[PDB]
């Protein structure tokens, strides 16, 4: 698909840099015709077919295609897409409350109520995605944003659909790989992937929300990946002594090696606790 090739600067004014990635930079912007604000994600294109630098057209179009289909309170929306010789520019819904990653860094540890407040929104967003057979594949604190972090119960939106894929055949087999700390065993072992991988990531996020500690984190990437594959984690008493057994039960049913035995997004919403790259 070809995108708008007029100079983005003729329709938008950019400002503060919101975030960055290996092949992308995100900047706050303002559309001239409406005065409304957005987050412009500039993704670097590949200059040749056989190159490591930049993102392939196929990968950019996949992210755009997925974004165009979604509309839900807990997921980011796509406003427009521009492009030029060097970048494809996605004009995304702005989430100005910062990364959950930074919010957690400033508060250390949350209560189970604060944790479930965040988790319930994350689950609702993932429920929406999984309902459309969309696997996110990159769920982690830096890919979850707060609309306003100066509120007791911040609302969130899932962002970064750079690894997202449609799972119309139940599974995708293409070496998709994210951040060692959050990837599921099937990703580590390069096996067919499905919506189940996201549920594992949710388990890791929950563990972090409740303790401020990462379950599989090692001193090196290989150590982390080895820990993940062996499901090498435990609930340290120093961190979980005052955490309910139900909270641990929730986590335990997500951090399951066999994708088929892992809780599904629907299971997670009905669970008693809730129910009301990778290289050297
Ligand atoms: N809609 C948004 N609103 C506000 N900040 C955003 C938004 N989208 C992304 N960001 C910020 O920009 C950072 C990078 O964007 P993201 O879409 O996560 O790219 P990425 O896939 O990590 N990049 P790359 O490393 O090149 O693959 C995020 O981690 C956020 O801090
Ligand atoms: Mn990201």
Curated annotation (Swiss-Prot):
Transmembrane segments: none annotated. ATP binds at residues 18-26, 41, 93-95, 99, 160. Ubiquitinated by the BCR(KLHL20) E3 ubiquitin ligase complex, leading to its degradation by the proteasome. Removal of the C-terminal tail of isoform 2 (corresponding to amino acids 296-337 of isoform 2) by proteolytic cleavage stimulates maximally its membrane-blebbing function. It comes from the Eukaryota. Residues 12-274 form the Protein kinase domain. The active site is at residue 138. Disulfide bonds: none annotated. Isoform 2 is expressed in normal intestinal tissue as well as in colorectal carcinomas. Induction: Up-regulated following treatment with IFNG/IFN-gamma. The autoinhibitory domain sterically blocks the substrate peptide-binding site by making both hydrophobic and electrostatic contacts with the kinase core. Interacts with KLHL20. Interacts (via death domain) with MAPK1 and MAPK3. Interacts with MAP1B (via N-terminus). Interacts with PRKD1 in an oxidative stress-regulated manner. Interacts with PIN1, PDCD6, BECN1, TSC2 and STX1A. Interacts (via kinase domain) with DAPK3 (via kinase domain). Interacts with GRINB. Interacts (via death domain) with UNC5B (via death domain). Interacts with UNC5C (via death domain). Belongs to the protein kinase superfamily. CAMK Ser/Thr protein kinase family. DAP kinase subfamily. Calcium/calmodulin-dependent serine/threonine kinase involved in multiple cellular signaling pathways that trigger cell survival, apoptosis, and autophagy. Regulates both type I apoptotic and type II autophagic cell deaths signal, depending on the cellular setting. The former is caspase-dependent, while the latter is caspase-independent and is characterized by the accumulation of autophagic vesicles. Phosphorylates PIN1 resulting in inhibition of its catalytic activity, nuclear localization, and cellular function. Phosphorylates TPM1, enhancing stress fiber formation in endothelial cells. Isoform 2 cannot induce apoptosis but can induce membrane blebbing. This is Death-associated protein kinase 1. The gene is DAPK1. The chain holds residues 2 to 277 of 1430 of the full protein.
């Amino acid at each position: 698909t070809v995108f708008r090739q007029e100079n983005v600067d003729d329709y938008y004014d950019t400002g503060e840099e919101l975030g960055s990635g290996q092949f992308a930079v995100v900047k706050k912007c303002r559309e001239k015709s409406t005065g409304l604000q957005y987050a412009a994600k500039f993704i670097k294109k590949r200059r040749t077919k056989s190159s490591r630098r930049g993102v392939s057209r196929e990968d950019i179009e996949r992210e755009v295609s997925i974004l165009k289909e979604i509309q839900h309170p807990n997921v980011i929306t796509l406003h427009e897409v521009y492009e030029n010789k060097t970048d494809v520019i996605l004009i995304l819904e702005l989430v100005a409350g910062g990364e959950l990653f930074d919010f957690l860094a400033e508060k250390e540890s949350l209560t189970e109520e604060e944790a479930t407040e965040f988790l319930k929104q994350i689950l609702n967003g993932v429920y929406y995605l999984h309902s459309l057979q969309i696997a996110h594949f990159d769920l982690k604190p830096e890919n979850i944003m707060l609309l306003d972090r100066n509120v007791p119960k911040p609302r969130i939106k899932i962002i970064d659909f750079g690894l997202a894929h449609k799972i119309d055949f139940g599974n995708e087999f293409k070496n998709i790989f994210g951040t060692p700390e959050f990837v599921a065993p099937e990703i580590v072992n390069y096996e067919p992937l499905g919506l189940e991988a996201d549920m594992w990531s949710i388990g890791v996020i929950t563990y972090i929300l409740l303790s401020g500690a990462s379950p599989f984190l090692g001193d090196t990437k290989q150590e982390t990946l080895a820990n993940v594959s062996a499901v090498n984690y435990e609930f340290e008493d120093e961190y979980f002594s005052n955490t309910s057994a139900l909270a641990k039960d929730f986590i335990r049913r997500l951090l399951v090696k066999d994708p088929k035995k892992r809780m599904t997004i629907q299971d997670s919403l009905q669970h008693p606790w809730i129910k009301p790259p990778q290289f050297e």
